[PDB]
């Protein structure tokens, strides 16, 4: 049975930030749990944000507001940057 995970994406992000550093199975499982937990928090906050404003759709505005609500301080304002240009780059292509 095919089981999906964020292992290859965490690994290639690690090779970006540290090209000569490895990782273990337990640390990869912890990274997968972290990514799943943060995804669940941001998606739940955006779902509640769309519900409070009587909207049927989740757009990048709700995810941006969820990131500003959940991420503390400067870690928010870089991430708000890192999402935004990505959307802009997506707009440059699709």
């Amino acid at each position: 049975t095919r089981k999906e995970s964020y292992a290859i994406y965490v690994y290639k992000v690690l090779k970006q930030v540290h090209p000569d550093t490895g990782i273990s199975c337990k640390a990869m499982s912890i990274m997968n749990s972290f990514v799943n937990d943060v995804f669940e928090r941001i998606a739940g906050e955006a779902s509640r944000l769309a519900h409070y404003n009587k909207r049927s759709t989740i757009t990048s505005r709700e995810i941006q507001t969820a990131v500003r609500l959940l991420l503390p301080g400067e870690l928010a304002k870089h991430a708000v940057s890192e999402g935004t240009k990505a959307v802009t780059k997506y707009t440059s292509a699709k």
């Binding site: 906050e45 509640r48 944000l49 409070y52 709700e62 609500l69």
Partner: protein, 88 residues
């Protein structure tokens, strides 16, 4: 020099000493030291910035400039402090 600044800066001092004493009386405090009030003002300020920042975020998501009571309710819930009596 009768003219001066329009804005007021020591609005944290509007939380007066007898108000902090009354709040401690509701908490069952018998004796209060004199250094309590500045620490209480700092704690109140930190709590108020934490709630008000999230409420302003909820206000700006709705493309509004008026902070409603429901935004204050949503903000407190997200900080783990559910408040009844204003949700309806």
């Amino acid at each position: 020099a009768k003219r001066h600044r329009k804005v007021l800066r020591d609005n944290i001092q509007g939380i007066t000493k007898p108000a902090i004493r009354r709040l401690a009386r509701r908490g069952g405090v018998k004796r209060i030291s004199g250094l309590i009030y500045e620490e209480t003002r700092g704690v109140l300020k930190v709590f108020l910035e934490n709630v008000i920042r999230d409420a302003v975020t909820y206000t700006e998501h709705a493309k509004r400039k008026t902070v409603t009571a429901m935004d204050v309710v949503y903000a407190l819930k997200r900080q783990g402090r559910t408040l009844y009596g204003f949700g309806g």
